[PDB]
Design an enzyme around this catalytic site. Structure first.
Site, PDB file in Angstrom:
ATOM      1  N   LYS A   1     -14.216  -7.450  -8.821  1.00 52.09           N
ATOM      2  CA  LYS A   1     -13.474  -8.271  -9.943  1.00 52.09           C
ATOM      3  C   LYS A   1     -13.294  -9.636  -8.320  1.00 52.09           C
ATOM      4  CE  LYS A   1     -10.217  -8.328 -13.953  1.00 52.09           C
ATOM      5  NZ  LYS A   1      -8.850  -7.447 -13.410  1.00 52.09           N
ATOM      6  N   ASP A   2     -12.732  -9.261  -7.659  1.00 52.70           N
ATOM      7  CA  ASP A   2     -12.244 -10.271  -7.030  1.00 52.70           C
ATOM      8  C   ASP A   2     -13.262 -11.344  -6.065  1.00 52.70           C
ATOM      9  OD1 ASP A   2      -9.829  -8.265  -4.642  1.00 52.70           O
ATOM     10  OD2 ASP A   2     -10.504  -9.154  -7.564  1.00 52.70           O
TER      11      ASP A   2
ATOM     12  N   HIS B   1       0.915  -1.216   0.125  1.00 48.66           N
ATOM     13  CA  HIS B   1      -0.123   0.044  -0.260  1.00 48.66           C
ATOM     14  C   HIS B   1       0.886   0.954  -0.226  1.00 48.66           C
ATOM     15  CE1 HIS B   1      -3.793  -2.608   1.682  1.00 48.66           C
ATOM     16  NE2 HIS B   1      -3.815  -2.224   0.602  1.00 48.66           N
TER      17      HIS B   1
ATOM     18  N   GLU C   1       5.023 -34.279  -2.602  1.00 44.09           N
ATOM     19  CA  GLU C   1       3.638 -33.805  -2.847  1.00 44.09           C
ATOM     20  C   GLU C   1       4.092 -33.136  -3.904  1.00 44.09           C
ATOM     21  OE1 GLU C   1       5.168 -34.422   0.190  1.00 44.09           O
ATOM     22  OE2 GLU C   1       4.296 -32.863   1.570  1.00 44.09           O
TER      23      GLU C   1
ATOM     24  N   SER D   1      -0.701  -0.675  -6.252  1.00 40.75           N
ATOM     25  CA  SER D   1      -0.345  -1.825  -6.837  1.00 40.75           C
ATOM     26  C   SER D   1       0.286  -1.283  -8.417  1.00 40.75           C
ATOM     27  CB  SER D   1      -2.163  -2.501  -7.826  1.00 40.75           C
ATOM     28  OG  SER D   1      -3.002  -3.162  -6.461  1.00 40.75           O
TER      29      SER D   1
HETATM   30  C1  HEM Z   1       0.255 -15.909   1.540  1.00 45.14           C
HETATM   31  C2  HEM Z   1       1.016 -15.775   0.435  1.00 45.14           C
HETATM   32  C3  HEM Z   1       0.610 -14.401   0.102  1.00 45.14           C
HETATM   33  C4  HEM Z   1      -1.161 -13.466  -0.118  1.00 45.14           C
HETATM   34  C5  HEM Z   1      -1.638 -13.844   0.160  1.00 45.14           C
HETATM   35  C6  HEM Z   1      -0.567 -12.622  -0.879  1.00 45.14           C
HETATM   36  C7  HEM Z   1      -1.558 -11.540  -1.403  1.00 45.14           C
HETATM   37  C8  HEM Z   1      -1.251 -10.707  -1.329  1.00 45.14           C
HETATM   38  C9  HEM Z   1      -1.912  -9.368  -2.447  1.00 45.14           C
HETATM   39  C10 HEM Z   1      -3.661  -9.039  -1.914  1.00 45.14           C
HETATM   40  C11 HEM Z   1      -1.892  -8.386  -3.114  1.00 45.14           C
HETATM   41  C12 HEM Z   1      -2.632  -7.667  -4.133  1.00 45.14           C
HETATM   42  C13 HEM Z   1      -2.980  -7.985  -5.209  1.00 45.14           C
HETATM   43  C14 HEM Z   1      -2.161  -8.473  -6.157  1.00 45.14           C
HETATM   44  O1  HEM Z   1      -1.266  -7.964  -6.650  1.00 45.14           O
HETATM   45  O2  HEM Z   1      -1.809 -10.112  -6.545  1.00 45.14           O
HETATM   46  C15 HEM Z   1      -0.093  -9.412  -3.105  1.00 45.14           C
HETATM   47  C16 HEM Z   1       0.797  -8.370  -4.175  1.00 45.14           C
HETATM   48  C17 HEM Z   1       1.803  -8.793  -4.298  1.00 45.14           C
HETATM   49  N1  HEM Z   1       2.612  -9.492  -3.616  1.00 45.14           N
HETATM   50 FE1  HEM Z   1       1.854 -11.143  -2.530  1.00 45.14          FE
HETATM   51  N2  HEM Z   1       1.183 -12.763  -1.392  1.00 45.14           N
HETATM   52  C18 HEM Z   1       1.625 -13.850  -0.877  1.00 45.14           C
HETATM   53  C19 HEM Z   1       2.721 -14.250  -1.181  1.00 45.14           C
HETATM   54  C20 HEM Z   1       3.303 -13.362  -2.106  1.00 45.14           C
HETATM   55  C21 HEM Z   1       4.437 -14.091  -2.692  1.00 45.14           C
HETATM   56  C22 HEM Z   1       5.049 -15.424  -2.707  1.00 45.14           C
HETATM   57  C23 HEM Z   1       5.445 -12.911  -3.574  1.00 45.14           C
HETATM   58  C24 HEM Z   1       6.452 -12.964  -4.740  1.00 45.14           C
HETATM   59  C25 HEM Z   1       7.975 -14.041  -4.104  1.00 45.14           C
HETATM   60  C26 HEM Z   1       5.002 -11.715  -3.393  1.00 45.14           C
HETATM   61  C27 HEM Z   1       4.823 -10.414  -3.912  1.00 45.14           C
HETATM   62  C28 HEM Z   1       3.852  -9.815  -4.317  1.00 45.14           C
HETATM   63  C29 HEM Z   1       4.484  -8.164  -4.686  1.00 45.14           C
HETATM   64  C30 HEM Z   1       5.413  -7.956  -5.793  1.00 45.14           C
HETATM   65  C31 HEM Z   1       2.814  -8.030  -5.179  1.00 45.14           C
HETATM   66  C32 HEM Z   1       2.810  -6.666  -6.255  1.00 45.14           C
HETATM   67  C33 HEM Z   1       1.686  -7.020  -7.195  1.00 45.14           C
HETATM   68  C34 HEM Z   1       1.853  -5.734  -8.695  1.00 45.14           C
HETATM   69  O3  HEM Z   1       2.819  -5.937  -8.994  1.00 45.14           O
HETATM   70  O4  HEM Z   1       0.953  -4.410  -8.064  1.00 45.14           O
HETATM   71  N3  HEM Z   1       3.551 -12.393  -3.084  1.00 45.14           N
HETATM   72  N4  HEM Z   1       0.206  -9.791  -2.548  1.00 45.14           N
HETATM   73  C1  LIG Z   2      10.230 -28.446  12.263  1.00 42.74           C
HETATM   74  C2  LIG Z   2      10.308 -28.017  10.736  1.00 42.74           C
HETATM   75  C3  LIG Z   2      10.664 -28.445   9.040  1.00 42.74           C
HETATM   76  C4  LIG Z   2      12.038 -29.018   9.707  1.00 42.74           C
HETATM   77  C5  LIG Z   2      11.001 -26.743   8.786  1.00 42.74           C
HETATM   78  C6  LIG Z   2      11.213 -27.844   6.831  1.00 42.74           C
HETATM   79  C7  LIG Z   2      11.520 -27.034   6.154  1.00 42.74           C
HETATM   80  C8  LIG Z   2      11.665 -27.049   4.948  1.00 42.74           C
HETATM   81  C9  LIG Z   2      11.509 -26.718   3.709  1.00 42.74           C
HETATM   82  O1  LIG Z   2      10.681 -25.677   3.944  1.00 42.74           O
HETATM   83  C10 LIG Z   2      11.507 -24.173   3.643  1.00 42.74           C
HETATM   84  C11 LIG Z   2      10.775 -27.836   2.215  1.00 42.74           C
HETATM   85  C12 LIG Z   2       9.401 -27.815   2.849  1.00 42.74           C
HETATM   86  C13 LIG Z   2      10.910 -27.692   1.013  1.00 42.74           C
HETATM   87  O2  LIG Z   2      12.679 -27.153   0.524  1.00 42.74           O
HETATM   88  C14 LIG Z   2      13.103 -25.853   0.698  1.00 42.74           C
HETATM   89  C15 LIG Z   2      10.792 -28.443   0.350  1.00 42.74           C
HETATM   90  C16 LIG Z   2      10.451 -28.387  -1.183  1.00 42.74           C
HETATM   91  C17 LIG Z   2      11.226 -29.927  -0.110  1.00 42.74           C
HETATM   92  C18 LIG Z   2      10.556 -30.587  -0.812  1.00 42.74           C
HETATM   93  C19 LIG Z   2      11.362 -32.271  -0.688  1.00 42.74           C
HETATM   94  O3  LIG Z   2       9.912 -33.438  -0.010  1.00 42.74           O
HETATM   95  C20 LIG Z   2      10.133 -34.337  -0.759  1.00 42.74           C
HETATM   96  C21 LIG Z   2       8.695 -34.886   0.678  1.00 42.74           C
HETATM   97  O4  LIG Z   2       7.447 -34.509   0.591  1.00 42.74           O
HETATM   98  C22 LIG Z   2       8.620 -36.452   0.675  1.00 42.74           C
HETATM   99  O5  LIG Z   2       7.557 -37.089   1.226  1.00 42.74           O
HETATM  100  C23 LIG Z   2       6.351 -37.420  -0.441  1.00 42.74           C
HETATM  101  C24 LIG Z   2       9.656 -36.962   0.111  1.00 42.74           C
HETATM  102  C25 LIG Z   2      10.877 -37.049   0.141  1.00 42.74           C
HETATM  103  O6  LIG Z   2      12.203 -37.094  -0.623  1.00 42.74           O
HETATM  104  C26 LIG Z   2      12.454 -38.554  -0.429  1.00 42.74           C
HETATM  105  C27 LIG Z   2      11.253 -34.910  -0.447  1.00 42.74           C
HETATM  106  C28 LIG Z   2      12.286 -34.357  -0.941  1.00 42.74           C
HETATM  107  O7  LIG Z   2      13.542 -34.780  -1.062  1.00 42.74           O
HETATM  108  C29 LIG Z   2      12.287 -33.049  -1.113  1.00 42.74           C
HETATM  109  C30 LIG Z   2      13.484 -31.920  -1.529  1.00 42.74           C
END
Ligand code: HEM
Ligand SMILES: C/C=C(C)/C=C/C=C/[C@H](OC)[C@@H](C)[C@@H](OC)[C@@H](C)CCc1oc2c(O)c(OC)cc(OC)c2c(=O)c1C
Ligand SMILES: CCCCCCCCCCCCCCCCCC(=O)OC[C@H](COP(=O)([O-])OCC(O)COP(=O)([O-])OC[C@@H](COC(=O)CCCCCCCCCCCCCCCCC)OC(=O)CCCCCCCCCCCCCCCCC)OC(=O)CCCCCCCCCCCCCCCCC
Ligand SMILES: CCCCCCCC/C=C\CCCCCCCC(=O)OC[C@H](COP(=O)(O)OCCN)OC(=O)CCCCCCC/C=C\CCCCCCCC
Ligand SMILES: CCCCCCCC/C=C\CCCCCCCC(=O)OC[C@H](COP(=O)(O)OCCN)OC(=O)CCCCCCC/C=C\CCCCCCCC
Ligand code: HEC
Ligand code: HEM
Ligand SMILES: CCCCCCCCCCCC(=O)OC[C@H](COP(=O)(O)OCC[N+](C)(C)C)OC(=O)CCCCCCCCCCC
Ligand code: FES
Lengths: 79, 101, 59, 49, 241, 49, 67, 379, 48
Positions: H227-228, H201, H271, H205
């Protein structure tokens, strides 16, 4: 908090709009709508499709190839 | 040579920002340098750029573009900001070199 | 003119509008639920315990 | 057990190939399967631990 | 070995997204489970009450229930003791623990069938193909003593002997107890067992789609309506002259 | 004070005292015919012979 | 006494184009393996190709005959 | 005063962010995921609480309690389905959200993007521990593997694993702390989401054209509220269709088998939303490298902002960038495919390529093509 | 729990073994007795 009023400096721009009740929600569905849907589709398909079409093949190949290597080679027991 | 010169014309049409009625300079991302430049723009030029942009935004929300007949032609694109921007960046670089001095 | 009558008598006043939605759902619910089940049970004749039932029931 | 390309074992998680000695031969695994402390105290009765 | 035979796709009457289970066939499958499979397979998550209103009448279920002696207690002296079954009891475990079961099956452990179709890729298509797909090993394949050949089972050497064969029981509804007929009924049962909601799950889906259509539509009109103001909006640059 | 509270709380995560430390396991080398591997429950994770 | 429609149709299906050639391919394998002593081959593959083609067919109408 | 919509300490906020909030007049559907993501979070939390009411964090009871939930608790089956599938639509949506951001240069809003990354990472960990709760074969071994990833850290590492398990092997102490951890995180997500929107904000956007929209803003309501809502209903159909018609479609059937500490299923796959990363990690035939690769495969998102070389903000007018983009999307689609396949040829090599491919399009090609494109613009 | 409080590790182990504990199931799914381990808890005089 409030943003509407600062935003930007604008001059000499007139706009005209009508109440939602004086017009149609979805008008010129054929004379205008679809024609553009196509326009847009057309203009992006050559940018999108390629990498996907590509990966698609890579899939089929790798899949088939992996499967081929399953079948047995008769030349291994013709002895 | 006249290679990238035609390459450029190609890219210019490929980019397509002209189908919206924008000049190359209109599409510039507004970082610090650009914002400073935009400030120096004579009023007519500034008011015009605004309208071009506002019209493009309206086109975008509409999911439309200008009729082929109104698209800007590669050779008629005015780099109205380019020069100002140069100076701005030129000016900044000096201060910078000077302050490290 | 339903659209006029409807508007004039239901959609205009924010209150009557609300009451109309309540009333609406009510009738819609009954209607929908019945018909939906009807469509489902029809597409699945003789397969539901509803259908089999009588064979192990009373008399 | 009885899988892989080394007549030993195969870990189905990331492709580690162990031989009949339980040694890491191929795959991402860093070391050879652990060996416990045991003693053949019988004719056909061994004790581990 | 590194090769496996995936099962075909039979047209189960419940395969379709709007297709309920054939309760008659589910009733049948039950019998097959009860009179044949239960001897080695536990169905820990189902109880005689679950049958009521699905495949059996309440009385029938109560009946089926009482046919089993259940261990309860402790009593006044802190003693365990037997008692008839209640519709609240779950289907009887053939063994008190895997060790015992394995002991009575060549070390092979018959899995609990409660969630079997979902615990195996292929589900009833796989379970069905397995039950009927028994046969002799191909040339060069020796099936270790105790294990039987089955091309559909991973490894082809399963520990379970063909559980069913023609007339291994008699459907009290008069259905011809052919081996495949049986497999078809028990598989249909194993599906219901793994997910009783199955039918309601689908009936809901139907209602869901209908509403989702009606509603997505009305909201598309609504979104458009409000936005028209902007879609048709016209503007012009009239600088001063 | 801080170092100690963190210390304590951090260690409330580590293995508890009910986490024993058990003994061996005997195994009749006759149950394991030649050309075969067998797994036995032990100290938690498997144990090959 | 009775006849499992499974067998009835499994026969009819083995008449089929593919099965026949698959069945044949199998017989061939079986033959040379069953004979050639102290070998290393197997006829799983052929058995599967056969089975696969057969049962696929089976599973296409078998249910019509079942209740 | 005048209106109580702009003065009231609380409404001043709802009005300040969901009613009078100025928004570009041209943001497209690729801007609907922000709220869908929000709705997912709410939906997950809600069905989650409902489920947590019937769960039992104990190795000897976890699996069956979930079963009881589905079989005995009224609509328990539905709730569990919505929770299981919601997780997926959470990732589906988050992935598209991330895409949009890369394509339209939203990452130039650094704090919004960075927090976004934290959200992704947290969502990941959250979904992980959560999946470990039914305690099926996959739950157990997934737990075993993922937590084990940290053993890769020099010296300490293991010591960190001990914590993660509360023991010297996955067991009850782990299950119970995981249930807690899973119960907690969703809220840290909701919390961070507030920081996300707050930073957002500050700037407002961004929009498809990647140029200032101050010349044309519109009140969030009724334009985007409407829209949403429409957007939600569109995502809702497939999600429910899947949930009500093909419940276990997106789920592994191997997890219907209670965890067996002594047997890792021969076919064990992560997964779907983890496959791409899983794939990258399998490629490096080294423990530490694979981990680092894994870490990098996600952490790299932090660099994107410093890799922007284009003189233009979005790829709307950059045809070369556009192709490189879709190439990347397919590159991942490929890595996902690979993840589902056994560690064998030609799969292995393809994976390694895609992997190598992935980091290259992000670290080298993109900044390069951007520079190249600038010159082509005569800049 | 006695160890290092009231008794030496040995003493505790000893006290432990003095009790027969029911374990299992075994290879046939049978319960059976066994000596006590320091890990066992003090013996319930009654089963309920
Ligand atoms: C629980 C996860 C998340 C929620 C609920 C969320 C929600 C939102 C909301 C409500 C908006 C405004 C509407 C829209 O542009 O879509 C927004 C914008 C944005 N979000 Fe997220 N977001 C999440 C995760 C992330 C992630 C993973 C990224 C990227 C690494 C990210 C990057 C951004 C950016 C860059 C904007 C700017 C949008 C624009 O271009 O105007 N968000 N997010
Ligand atoms: C107490 C909490 C703790 C320790 C949290 C840990 C969080 C770690 C990371 O999150 C940030 C992690 C989830 C994320 O790594 C970036 C995933 C993309 C890794 C994905 C992942 O899944 C597997 C999986 O699901 C399996 O079963 C169905 C079996 C698996 O191999 C035999 C894997 C596996 O080899 C990998 C790389
Ligand atoms: C309803 C579908 C829209 C039909 C259409 O193509 O409109 C063309 C046309 C409108 O033409 P237009 O004015 O050029 O288009 C303006 C926008 O595209 C008009 O579209 P819009 O901006 O109002 O809405 C776009 C909408 C539509 O999204 C689609 O394109 C589908 O997408 C969203 O709102 C985003 C939500 C995405 C949900 C996906 C969830 C992921 C789960 C994956 C599994 O409408 C018709 O011809 C009538 C259709 C009845
Ligand atoms: C037995 C049957 C069940 C009984 C149900 C209980 C009855 C509920 C009563 C609701 C009363 C509704 C009254 C609304 C009046 C508000 C109002 O001013 O109008 C609507 C007002 C806009 O004003 P106008 O229509 O343009 O003009 C006003 C006319 N003078 O609000 C709107 O925009 C309405 C839009 C509603 C749709 C939005 C929600 C759709 C969401 C999608 C997913 C849905 C399914 C899942 C929901 C379950 C939640 C856990
Ligand atoms: C990670 C694992 C996930 C596995 C992959 C799942 C992805 C599923 C398939 C891709 C879904 C996208 C559908 C294709 C849409 C085609 C389309 O409309 O593209 C053209 C359209 C035109 O843009 P303009 O130039 O602004 O138009 C204005 C002038 N008229 O471009 C766009 O829609 C913008 C890009 C949308 C983003 C979609 C990205 C999909 C998700 C992938 C994740 C990528 C990011 C990195 C993740 C790291 C972890
Ligand atoms: C005599 C005991 C016995 C009976 C009765 C029996 N089974 Fe089994 N079943 C077993 C054993 C033993 C296994 C384990 C085989 C293995 O995993 O090596 C097994 C395994 C199975 C499996 C598949 C395991 C897998 O990994 O694919 C299914 C499915 C199954 N039985 C279904 C049935 C059904 C349905 C019935 C009744 C029609 C039935 N069984 C009757 C003993 C039996
Ligand atoms: C970030 C939002 C959430 C995500 C991404 C999420 C994801 C998941 C996942 C993937 C599982 C395993 C699903 C399965 O059984 O296949 C799960 C299980 C579970 N989650 Fe969540 N969850 C979320 C929020 C919550 C919250 C806030 C609670 C409750 C306080 C909760 C309670 C549970 C319970 C009880 C289970 C275990 C039983 C079951 O599998 O249904 N979850 N969750
Ligand atoms: C303000 C006063 C704080 C004094 C704390 C302190 O510093 O008190 C010292 C103690 C640490 O005891 P110890 O050194 O591990 O005992 C040694 C015994 N051995 C040798 C047998 C292992 O801390 C505490 O548990 C105090 C808990 C404070 C609660 C914090 C609020 C949340
Ligand atoms: S855990 Fe064995 S290969 Fe990774």
């Amino acid at each position: 908090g409030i943003h509407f009023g600062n935003l930007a400096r604008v001059r000499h721009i007139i706009t005209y709009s009508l109440s939602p009740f004086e017009q149609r929600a979805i008008p010129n569905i054929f004379s205008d709508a679809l024609p553009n849907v196509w326009r847009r589709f057309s203009s992006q398909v050559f940018k999108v499709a390629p990498p996907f079409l590509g990966a698609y093949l890579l899939y089929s190949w790798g899949t088939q190839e992996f499967e081929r290597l399953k079948r047995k080679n008769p030349a291994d027991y013709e002895n | 040579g006249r290679l990238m010169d035609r390459i450029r014309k190609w890219y210019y049409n490929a980019a397509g920002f002209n189908k919206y009625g924008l000049m190359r300079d209109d599409t510039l991302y507004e970082d610090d340098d650009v914002k400073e430049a935009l400030k120096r723009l004579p009023e007519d030029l500034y008011n015009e750029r605004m309208f071009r942009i506002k019209r493009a935004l309206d086109l975008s929300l509409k999911h439309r573009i200008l009729p082929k007949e109104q698209w800007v032609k590669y050779e008629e694109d005015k780099p109205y900001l380019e020069p100002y921007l140069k100076e701005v960046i030129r000016e900044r670089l000096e201060r910078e070199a000077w302050n490290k001095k | 003119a339903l659209l006029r009558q409807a508007y004039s008598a239901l959609f205009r006043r924010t209150s009557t509008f609300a009451l109309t939605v309540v009333l609406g759902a009510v009738l819609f619910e009954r209607a929908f639920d019945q018909g939906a089940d009807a469509i489902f049970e029809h597409l699945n004749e003789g397969k539901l315990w509803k259908h089999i039932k009588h064979k192990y029931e009373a008399s | 057990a009885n899988s892989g390309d080394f007549g030993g074992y195969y870990c189905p998680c990331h492709g580690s190939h162990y031989d009949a000695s339980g040694r890491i031969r191929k795959g991402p695994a860093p070391y050879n399967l652990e060996v416990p402390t045991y003693q053949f105290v019988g004719d056909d009765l061994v004790v581990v631990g | 070995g590194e090769l496996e035979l995936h099962p075909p796709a039979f047209p189960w009457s419940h395969g379709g997204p709007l297709s309920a289970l054939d309760h008659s066939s589910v009733r049948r499958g039950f019998q097959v489970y009860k009179q044949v499979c239960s001897a080695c397979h536990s169905m820990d998550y189902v109880a005689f009450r679950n049958l009521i209103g699905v495949t059996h009448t309440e009385a029938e279920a109560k009946a089926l229930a009482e046919e089993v002696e259940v261990q309860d207690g402790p009593d006044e002296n802190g003693e365990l003791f037997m008692r008839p079954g209640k519709i609240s009891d779950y289907f009887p475990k053939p063994y008190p623990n895997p060790e015992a079961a394995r002991a009575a099956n060549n070390g092979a452990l018959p899995p609990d069938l409660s969630y079997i179709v979902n615990a195996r890729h292929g589900g009833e298509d796989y379970v069905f193909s397995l039950l009927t797909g028994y046969c002799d090993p191909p040339a060069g394949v020796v099936v270790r003593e105790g294990l039987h050949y089955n091309p559909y089972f991973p490894g082809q050497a399963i520990g379970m002997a063909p559980p069913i064969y023609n007339e291994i029981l008699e459907y009290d509804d008069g259905t011809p107890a052919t081996m495949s007929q049986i497999a078809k009924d028990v598989c249909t049962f194993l599906r219901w067992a793994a997910e009783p909601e199955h039918d309601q799950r689908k009936r809901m889906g139907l209602k869901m789609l209908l509403i989702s259509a009606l509603l997505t539509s009305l909201l598309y009109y609504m979104k458009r309506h409000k936005w028209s103001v902007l879609k048709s909006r016209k503007m012009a640059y009239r600088p001063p002259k | 004070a801080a170092k100690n509270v963190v210390t304590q709380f951090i260690s409330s995560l580590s293995a508890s005292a009910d986490v024993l430390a058990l003994s061996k396991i005997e195994i009749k080398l006759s149950d394991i015919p030649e050309g075969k591997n067998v797994a036995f429950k032990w100290r938690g994770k498997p144990l090959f012979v | 006494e009775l006849v499992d429609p499974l067998t009835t149709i499994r026969e009819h299906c083995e008449q089929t184009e593919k099965c026949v050639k698959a069945r044949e391919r199998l017989e061939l394998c079986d033959a040379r393996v069953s004979s050639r002593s102290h070998t290393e081959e197997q006829c799983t593959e052929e058995l599967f190709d056969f089975l696969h083609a057969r049962d696929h067919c089976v599973a296409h109408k078998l249910f019509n005959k079942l209740k | 005063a005048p209106n109580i919509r702009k003065s009231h300490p609380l409404l001043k906020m709802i009005n300040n962010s969901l009613i009078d909030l100025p928004a570009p007049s041209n943001i497209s559907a690729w801007w609907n995921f922000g709220s869908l993501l929000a709705v997912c979070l709410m939906t997950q939390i809600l069905t989650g609480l409902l489920l947590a009411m019937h769960y039992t964090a104990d190795t000897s009871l976890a699996f069956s309690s979930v079963a009881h939930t589905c079989r005995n608790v009224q609509y328990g089956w539905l709730i569990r389905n919505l929770h299981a599938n919601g997780a997926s639509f959470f990732f589906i949506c988050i992935f598209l959200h991330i895409g949009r951001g890369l394509y339209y240069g939203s990452y130039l809003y650094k704090e919004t993007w960075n927090t976004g990354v934290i959200l992704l990472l947290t969502l990941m960990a959250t979904a992980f521990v959560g999946y470990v709760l039914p305690w099926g074969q996959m739950s157990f071994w997934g737990a075993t593997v993922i937590t084990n990833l940290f053993s890769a850290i020099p010296y300490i590492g293991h010591t960190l694993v001990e914590w993660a398990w509360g023991g010297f092997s996955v067991d009850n102490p782990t299950l119970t702390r995981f249930f807690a951890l899973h119960f907690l995180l969703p809220f840290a997500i909701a919390g961070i989401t507030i920081i996300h929107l707050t930073f957002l904000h500050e700037s407002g956007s961004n929009n498809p054209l990647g140029i200032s929209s101050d010349s044309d803003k519109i009140p969030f309501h009724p334009y985007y509220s409407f829209k949403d809502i429409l957007g939600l209903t569109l995502m809702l159909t497939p999600f429910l269709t899947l949930a009500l018609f093909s419940p276990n479609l997106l789920g592994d059937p191997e997890n219907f088998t209670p965890a067996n500490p002594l047997v890792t299923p021969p076919h064990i796959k992560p997964e779907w939303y983890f496959l791409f990363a899983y794939a990258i990690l399998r490629s490096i035939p080294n423990k530490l490298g694979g981990v680092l690769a894994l870490a990098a495969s996600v952490l790299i998102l932090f660099l994107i902002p410093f890799l922007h070389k284009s003189k233009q903000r979005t790829m709307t007018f950059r045809p070369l960038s556009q192709t490189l983009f879709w190439l990347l999307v397919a590159n991942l689609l490929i890595l996902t495919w690979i993840g589902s396949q056994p560690v064998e040829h030609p799969f292995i090599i393809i994976g390694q390529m895609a992997s190598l491919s992935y980091f290259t399009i992000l670290l080298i090609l993109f900044p390069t093509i951007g520079t190249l494109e600038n010159k082509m613009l005569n800049y």
